[PDB]
Amino acid sequence: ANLWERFCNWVTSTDNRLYVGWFGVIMIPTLLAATICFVIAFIAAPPVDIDGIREPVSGSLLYGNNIITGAVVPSSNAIGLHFYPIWEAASLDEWLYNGGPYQLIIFHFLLGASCYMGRQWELSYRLGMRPWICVAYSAPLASAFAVFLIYPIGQGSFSDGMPLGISGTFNFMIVFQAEHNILMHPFHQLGVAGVFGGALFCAMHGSLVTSSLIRETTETESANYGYKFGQEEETYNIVAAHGYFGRLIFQYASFNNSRSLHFFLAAWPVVGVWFTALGISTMAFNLNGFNFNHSVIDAKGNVINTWADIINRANLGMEVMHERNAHNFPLDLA
Amino acid sequence: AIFRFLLFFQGFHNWTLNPFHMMGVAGVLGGALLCAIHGATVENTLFQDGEGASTFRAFNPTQAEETYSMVTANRFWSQIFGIAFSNKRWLHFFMLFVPVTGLWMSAIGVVGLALNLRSYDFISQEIRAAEDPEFETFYTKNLLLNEGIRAWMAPQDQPHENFVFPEEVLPRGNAL
Amino acid sequence: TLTYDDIVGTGLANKCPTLDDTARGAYPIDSSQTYRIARLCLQPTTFLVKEEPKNKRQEAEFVPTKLVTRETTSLDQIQGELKVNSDGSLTFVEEDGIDFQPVTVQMAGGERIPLLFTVKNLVASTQPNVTSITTSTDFKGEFNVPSYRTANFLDPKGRGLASGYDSAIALPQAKEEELARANVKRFSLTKGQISLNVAKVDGRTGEIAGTFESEQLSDDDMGAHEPHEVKIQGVFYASIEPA
Amino acid sequence: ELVNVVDEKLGTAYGEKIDLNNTNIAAFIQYRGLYPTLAKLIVKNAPYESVEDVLNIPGLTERQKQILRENLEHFTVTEVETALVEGGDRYNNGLYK
Amino acid sequence: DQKLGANVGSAQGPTGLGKYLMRSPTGEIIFGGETMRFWDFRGPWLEPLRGPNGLDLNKIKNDIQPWQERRAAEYMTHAPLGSLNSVGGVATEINSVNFVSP
Amino acid sequence: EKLAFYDYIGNNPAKGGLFRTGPMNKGDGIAQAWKGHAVFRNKEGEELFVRRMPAFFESFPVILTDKNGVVKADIPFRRAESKYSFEQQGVTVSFYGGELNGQTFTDPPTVKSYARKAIFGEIFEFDTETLNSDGIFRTSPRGWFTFAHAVFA
Amino acid sequence: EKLAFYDYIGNNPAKGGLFRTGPMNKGDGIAQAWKGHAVFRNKEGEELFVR
Amino acid sequence: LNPMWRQGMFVLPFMARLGVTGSWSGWSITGETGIDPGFWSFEGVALAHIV
Amino acid sequence: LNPMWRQGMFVLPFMARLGVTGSWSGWSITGETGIDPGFWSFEGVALAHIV
Amino acid sequence: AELTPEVLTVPLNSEGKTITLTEKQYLEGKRLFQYACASCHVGGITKTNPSLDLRTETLALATPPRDNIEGLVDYMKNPTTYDGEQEIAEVHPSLRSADIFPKMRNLTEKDLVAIAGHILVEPKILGDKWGGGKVYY
Numbered sequence A: 001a002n003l004w005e006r007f008c009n010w011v012t013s014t015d016n017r018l019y020v021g022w023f024g025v026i027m028i029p030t031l032l033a034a035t036i037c038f039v040i041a042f043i044a045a046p047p048v049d050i051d052g053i054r055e056p057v058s059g060s061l062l063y064g065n066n067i068i069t070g071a072v073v074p075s076s077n078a079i080g081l082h083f084y085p086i087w088e089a090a091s092l093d094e095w096l097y098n099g100g101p102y103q104l105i106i107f108h109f110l111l112g113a114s115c116y117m118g119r120q121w122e123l124s125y126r127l128g129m130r131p132w133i134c135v136a137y138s139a140p141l142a143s144a145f146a147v148f149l150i151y152p153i154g155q156g157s158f159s160d161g162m163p164l165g166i167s168g169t170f171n172f173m174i175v176f177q178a179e180h181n182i183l184m185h186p187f188h189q190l191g192v193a194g195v196f197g198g199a200l201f202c203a204m205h206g207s208l209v210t211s212s213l214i215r216e217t218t219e220t221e222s223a224n225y226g227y228k229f230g231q232e233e234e235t236y237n238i239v240a241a242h243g244y245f246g247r248l249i250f251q252y253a254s255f256n257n258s259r260s261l262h263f264f265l266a267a268w269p270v271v272g273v274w275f276t277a278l279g280i281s282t283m284a285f286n287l288n289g290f291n292f293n294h295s296v297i298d299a300k301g302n303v304i305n306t307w308a309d310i311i312n313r314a315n316l317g318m319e320v321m322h323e324r325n326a327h328n329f330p331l332d333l334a
Numbered sequence B: 001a002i003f004r005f006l007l008f009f010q011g012f013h014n015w016t017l018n019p020f021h022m023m024g025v026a027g028v029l030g031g032a033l034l035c036a037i038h039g040a041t042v043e044n045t046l047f048q049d050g051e052g053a054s055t056f057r058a059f060n061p062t063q064a065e066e067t068y069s070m071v072t073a074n075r076f077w078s079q080i081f082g083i084a085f086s087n088k089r090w091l092h093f094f095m096l097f098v099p100v101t102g103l104w105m106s107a108i109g110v111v112g113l114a115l116n117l118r119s120y121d122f123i124s125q126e127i128r129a130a131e132d133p134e135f136e137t138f139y140t141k142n143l144l145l146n147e148g149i150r151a152w153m154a155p156q157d158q159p160h161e162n163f164v165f166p167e168e169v170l171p172r173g174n175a176l
Numbered sequence C: 001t002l003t004y005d006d007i008v009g010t011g012l013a014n015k016c017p018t019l020d021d022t023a024r025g026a027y028p029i030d031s032s033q034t035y036r037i038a039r040l041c042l043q044p045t046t047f048l049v050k051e052e053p054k055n056k057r058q059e060a061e062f063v064p065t066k067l068v069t070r071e072t073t074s075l076d077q078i079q080g081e082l083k084v085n086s087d088g089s090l091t092f093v094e095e096d097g098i099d100f101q102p103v104t105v106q107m108a109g110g111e112r113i114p115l116l117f118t119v120k121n122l123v124a125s126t127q128p129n130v131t132s133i134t135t136s137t138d139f140k141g142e143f144n145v146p147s148y149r150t151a152n153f154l155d156p157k158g159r160g161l162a163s164g165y166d167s168a169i170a171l172p173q174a175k176e177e178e179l180a181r182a183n184v185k186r187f188s189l190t191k192g193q194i195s196l197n198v199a200k201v202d203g204r205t206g207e208i209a210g211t212f213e214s215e216q217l218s219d220d221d222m223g224a225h226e227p228h229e230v231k232i233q234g235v236f237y238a239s240i241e242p243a
Numbered sequence D: 001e002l003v004n005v006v007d008e009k010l011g012t013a014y015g016e017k018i019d020l021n022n023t024n025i026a027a028f029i030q031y032r033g034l035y036p037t038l039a040k041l042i043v044k045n046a047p048y049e050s051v052e053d054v055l056n057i058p059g060l061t062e063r064q065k066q067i068l069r070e071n072l073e074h075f076t077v078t079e080v081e082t083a084l085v086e087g088g089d090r091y092n093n094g095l096y097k
Numbered sequence E: 001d002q003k004l005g006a007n008v009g010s011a012q013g014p015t016g017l018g019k020y021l022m023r024s025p026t027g028e029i030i031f032g033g034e035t036m037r038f039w040d041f042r043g044p045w046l047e048p049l050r051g052p053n054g055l056d057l058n059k060i061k062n063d064i065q066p067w068q069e070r071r072a073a074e075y076m077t078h079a080p081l082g083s084l085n086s087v088g089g090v091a092t093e094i095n096s097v098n099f100v101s102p
Numbered sequence F: 001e002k003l004a005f006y007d008y009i010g011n012n013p014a015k016g017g018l019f020r021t022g023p024m025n026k027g028d029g030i031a032q033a034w035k036g037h038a039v040f041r042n043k044e045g046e047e048l049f050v051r052r053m054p055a056f057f058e059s060f061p062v063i064l065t066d067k068n069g070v071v072k073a074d075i076p077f078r079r080a081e082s083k084y085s086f087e088q089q090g091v092t093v094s095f096y097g098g099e100l101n102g103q104t105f106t107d108p109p110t111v112k113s114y115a116r117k118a119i120f121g122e123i124f125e126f127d128t129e130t131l132n133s134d135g136i137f138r139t140s141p142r143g144w145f146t147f148a149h150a151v152f153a
Numbered sequence G: 001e002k003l004a005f006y007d008y009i010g011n012n013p014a015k016g017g018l019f020r021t022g023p024m025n026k027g028d029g030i031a032q033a034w035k036g037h038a039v040f041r042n043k044e045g046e047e048l049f050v051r
Numbered sequence H, I: 001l002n003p004m005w006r007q008g009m010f011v012l013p014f015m016a017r018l019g020v021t022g023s024w025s026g027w028s029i030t031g032e033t034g035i036d037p038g039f040w041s042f043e044g045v046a047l048a049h050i051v
Numbered sequence J: 001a002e003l004t005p006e007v008l009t010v011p012l013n014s015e016g017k018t019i020t021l022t023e024k025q026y027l028e029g030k031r032l033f034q035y036a037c038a039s040c041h042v043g044g045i046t047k048t049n050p051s052l053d054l055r056t057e058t059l060a061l062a063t064p065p066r067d068n069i070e071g072l073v074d075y076m077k078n079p080t081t082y083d084g085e086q087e088i089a090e091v092h093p094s095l096r097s098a099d100i101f102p103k104m105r106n107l108t109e110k111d112l113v114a115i116a117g118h119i120l121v122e123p124k125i126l127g128d129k130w131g132g133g134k135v136y137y
Ligand code: CLA
Pocket: A173, A195, A196, B005, B006, B007, B009, B010, B014, B015, B016, B021, B024, B025, B028, B029, B102, B103, B106, B107, B108, B110
C-alpha cells in the first residue's frame, strides 16, 4: 500500500486503544491546546481587565485564588467580539492583560468538542452500531455553545461569556437572572424538569433493575459478580420489575418494553437540556422571562404585590450592584 | 415562591458557595448525564431482532436474551472516552447511587443553613481585600451582588421587621 | 485624503499628523494679531518609570516599561489661546480637548503602573522675543494631574469617596486603625511639567511639529499607596491660526 | 487624620443649601425658574467669592437678576472641592433615579 | 449634558476613561461607557459626526441636528429588550410598555 | 456587665459560619469590658435609636429613628443626595455606665463608628491581639452541638 | 556596599545550624543598607578596634 | 465576660451540668475561691474515663 | 544586598553558572534592564525539564 | 379602596378651580398615556432626562405651572424647558410638532385633557411610586 493508504488505514483503525478517526485528527490538537493553555492560565495568569475599565480581576492560583475562586477570566470588554489571537498583541504582557487566553481556550475547546461529537458518530459507523449517541451528546454541547459563543455574540462581547471557573460561573448565573429573569423563562423551567427528571429516572431505573437482580451469588459476595461480561442471558427479571412498578402506581404507568424504557430515559433529559440551551441562546437576543411586575392591581389602582414582585426586588439588588464602575448612563442595554 | 426561596438563599446564605450544595449539583447533573447516556447507548447497541425499521416491536418482556450488545457498547465507550462499564449490575447500582447521594449531601447543607451555619466567606480573601483595594476576584464580586440582594429585597420580603431603608442607604453602583 | 474607512483598524488614528522633511522655515508673529492653537496632538512613544532602590543612597533612574493598554494613548483635538506677551514670548493656555488618557505600563517583574497621561489646564510659554516660530523654539509649561479614578469609583469591597461603604463590612469586629488608609478614600491633584521642542515649521500653513517630554506622577489608588514618577517622551503636532 | 472630604463637606452649608461653587446642576430644579438657563450660567461662571457675586454674571437680564435675588437665600458658597468638581461631575454626577 | 454646559471631550469618568468619549484599541475616537464594545456600529444618524480619526469633537460641539437628537432618543427607548409576554425594557421594568423588538 | 453582654449579637449562635473554626473569642476577640450604654441624639436633643442587625444579615446599614420609628439619621451610601447624614443632623453619642460612663462624643467619625457597633447591641471592648482574632463572628457550643446532632440524626 | 556586605559574618557559610531552616534572610533579616564604617575612639582620641 | 461558651468548650459544660464545677488547680467555673471539689474535679473525671 | 544566595536559592545559581540569566518577566540576575533572553530563560529551562 | 370621584377630582386651572374626571376619562387617559408617552415616561420618570419627572410637586414648580389640566394641555401643545425660557417642540412630542411625532397627529382636546388627568390622578393613587423610579418598584 502507498504511504497515504497506510496512514488512512491507521487513522481509521478500530484497533487503536483510543479511536482517532478523521474528526479526531482535528479534536486531538485542539483539545490539547485548550487544555494546556487552561491549566497554565488557571495556575499562573496575571489579572485580566474583563470589563475594559482598567480594573483587572485576578483569576489564577498564584495571584491569590483558591480552587473555588479561581478562573480564566473572559477577554476585555474593550475587545468586544474582535478576534484577539496572540499575534494580534504587541506582546504577551498585553495579551495577558487583555485576556487573550480565554479566547484561545474557548475557541479551541468549542472546535474540539464539535469534533468529539463527530467522532462519536464516526466510531459508531466503524463498529456497526446505530448512530445517535452523538445526538444525545448534542445537548450538553449546545449548552456549551450557548454560554461561550452565542450569548457573547448576542450581547456584543466575549467579556459576557461564562468565566472558566466555579465562582465565575456563579457570577454569570446571578447577573443572568438580574438581566433576563431566567427563572421565569419557560425554557429554563423545561431545563429544570429535564435535569430533575433525569436524576429521578436515573434513580428509578437503577433501583428497579437492582431490585430485580436474579440470585446468582451468596450473601458474602457482591451481587455484581452474578453478571459475567458478555453473557447472553439477561441479569434481572424485567417482568418482576414491571409487576412491582405497575402495582406501585398502576399497571399502565409502567414500561414492560425495555427498548421503550431506554428510549424514554434518553429522551427526557436530552430534550429538556436542548430547551434550556435554547433558553440561554434566545435570551442572548434579549427575549427574557415572563414579567408580571405589578400585574395585580386593586379597585383604586393600588399595586398588590405577588411573589413575582418579590423576585423583582431581588433582581433589582443584583442589577444595581453588578459591575459597579462600568455604567455611565441610566439603562443597561447590553 | 420557590424561585424567591432560591434567590433568598443566594443573597443571605451564599448557598452556591456551599460544598454540600455543590455535591448535590454534581449528583443531579451526573444523574441526568447517566440517564441520557445509558438510554442512548442501549438504543444504539440494540440487536436486530425483527425486520421493522421501528425497533421497539422487536422486544418481548418474557425473552431471556439481552436486547443490546454489552460487548459492543463497552468497546465503543472504551475507545471514545477511555473507560467504559463492563458489569451491568454495577452500572445500574451506580445509577441508583449518584442522584441519591447528591440529594443527601444537599440536605446536609440545608441542615447547616437552618442555623445560619453558612459557607459564606473565605477569610483569607477577605483579609487581603480589606487591606488591598486593587485585589478583586469573582468571589468578591458575588459578595457585592449578595449585599445588593439583601438591601433591596428585605423590606418587602420580611414585612414583620418594619424595615425602612432611606434611598440614600441603598447600595448601588454608578448610574444604576 | 484618508477617510475613516481607510483608517479604521490600522492604528493610524492614534498617531499625530507629521510634516515632511522640507518643512524647515519660519512662521511670522505680528505681536498685534490674536492667535489660537486649533489642534494640538501629543503622541507618546516611550513611558519611563523611576525605580525605587529601597536604599536612599544611590540615584534612582528612569527605566523602560511595556505598554499593555494598546493604541489608546494619544492626546488630540486640543485647542486654546496663544497670547503674545510683552517680552515677545508666546503663551499657550489650553481650554478644552481630549487632554487625558488612562495608560497602564508594565515594569520588569510584572508590576503594573497605571497613570492618567494628561495635559489638563496646560499653560506653556516660549523664550522671550519670539517674533517668529522657528525650529529653535520651545514651550515649557505646567499642567494639572487629577486623581486617576474620580469620586464615584468603588473598590472591590464597595468602598468609595462620594459613594460606597466607609468600613470593611466583611470584618465587622476588626480593629479599624490599621485599615484607615484603605477605608478612607482621598482625591489627589498634583502638578506635571512638559517641554515641547519644535523641529519642523511650515510657514505657509502655520503647522508646527516636534518632540515632547513630560513628567508627572502615576495613579495612587485614591491614596491607598504612593505614586511613581513617570516620564513620557513622544512627538507632537500643532496647528496655529490667526484669529 | 485621614478624612472623607465629601462627608466633611456635608457638615458645612453645602449640606443645607445649594453651594454655587460645588453642587451638581440638577439641584437647581428645587426652586422655580433656575433650571436650565440660570443653572448653566451659574455653573459655568463659578467659583464665586460671595453669594451676591452671582448677580454680576455678564449678560443677565433684569428678570434673571430678579429671580436670582429672590432665590439668594437658598444659595451658599464654600471653597471649591476638587472631588466634587472634577470629572465634569457638576454636570453629571452619575445619579439618575 | 453638553447642552447643560459639560465639556464632553474632557469629561473624566469614574474609572479614568472618558465619560462620553474614549479611544478604541486601535485609537479611533468612540463613545464611552459599556457601549465601547459597540464601536463598530455604523448608522446614518451617527455617521455625520465621524471623521478620519473617528467621532469628531468639533462636529459634536457644533453640528448635532435636532433630527439626530430625536432619532437617538427614539432608538435608546426602543432598544431590543423585552419579556416573553411583551413587556418592553429590562427585566426589572414594571408593566406599562407593550413592546418586543422584531 | 453579664446582662449587658448577653444583649450582644456576637453571642447569638446564629451568626457563625461552617468553616469559621474555633472559639467565639477567635472572632470578635476576648471581651474585656462593657463600654456603657450609648445614647444617640440629634442637634435638636431628641434621642435616636440604632436599628439592630437581624441574625439573617451578614452586613446591615446604620439607620437611626426616633421613638415613633421615624428615620432621623443614617450613614448614606451615595452622598450626593444625602439628607440624613450624621453631619447634617448633628448626631452626638453619650455613654452611661461602663468604661465610657459620662463621656460625650461629637466628632462625626467617632459617632459613626459607635453607631456601627450599636447595630450589634451593647458595645464592648475586646482584646483582639492575644488570639490574632480576625473580627468575623463564630457560633457557640450550642450551635455546633445542634448542627452535629441534627446531621447525625 | 557589595564589598562591605561581603565583609560581614552573617554571610559566612560556617555560621549556620542543621535545623535552622530556610534562607539566610530568615535569620538576620533582609539586608537594606550599609550603615557605614564604625570607628571607635576612647577619651584620648586614639582609634580602637573591635575584635 | 469570658465564660466557657466563649472559649469553644464542648465537654466542660456537660460536666458542669451534672455537678462537676471545681478544678484540682483550685478554681471553680462559678468564680468562687477556696473551694475543694475532692476527687471528682474536671481532672478526676478525665482520669476516670481514661482508666 | 539581596542576591540569590541570601534567599535560599539552590538551582538558580546552577542555571546562572552556564549562561541562563534572564526571566520572561523581564529581569536579569545581574540587575540589567530591557534584556530579552529568548526561550532559554529560567522559565523556559523549567518547562523544558518538565516536558 | 375604590376609584372615587374625590380621587378623580383634580385642579383645572391656576386659580384653584377643580374638575371631576369620569372613570372612563381616567381609563382613556391611561391608555393614551401608554400609547404616546410611556416609552419615555413609564411610571412618571423621564428616561431620556431623569432629572425631570412628572410628580405633581415638580409640575407645580415648573414655569409656567404644570400642576393643572390646562397647564398640561398647553405643555402638550407647546412644550418648554423647565424655566419656560425655551420652546422644545423640535425635540419633544406635541401638536405643533405632530409632523415629526406622528403619534400626536390624531390627538384631540378631550384626549389631551384625559392624558393630563391621568398624570394628575396617578400620584394620588400610587404615592411615591409615581416618578420614584426603580427604588419604589
Ligand atoms: C446547575 C444548577 C443547579 C442544580 C442542578 C441544583 C440542584 C439542586 N438544588 Mg440548587 N440552586 C442553584 C443551582 C442549582 N441547584 C442556584 C444557582 C441557587 C441559588 C442559591 C440554588 C438554590 C437552591 C436552594 C435554596 C435549594 C436548592 C436545592 C437543590 C436540590 C433539589 C433537590 C430536589 O429535587 O428537590 C425537589 C424536592 C423534593 C425531592 C422533595 C420531595 C418532592 C415530592 C416527592 C414531590 C411529590 C409531588 C406530588 C406527586 C404531586 C405534585 C403535583 C403538583 C405539582 C400539582 C438539588 C441538589 C434544595 C436543597 O438542597 O435541598 C436539600 C434547596 O432547598 N437549590
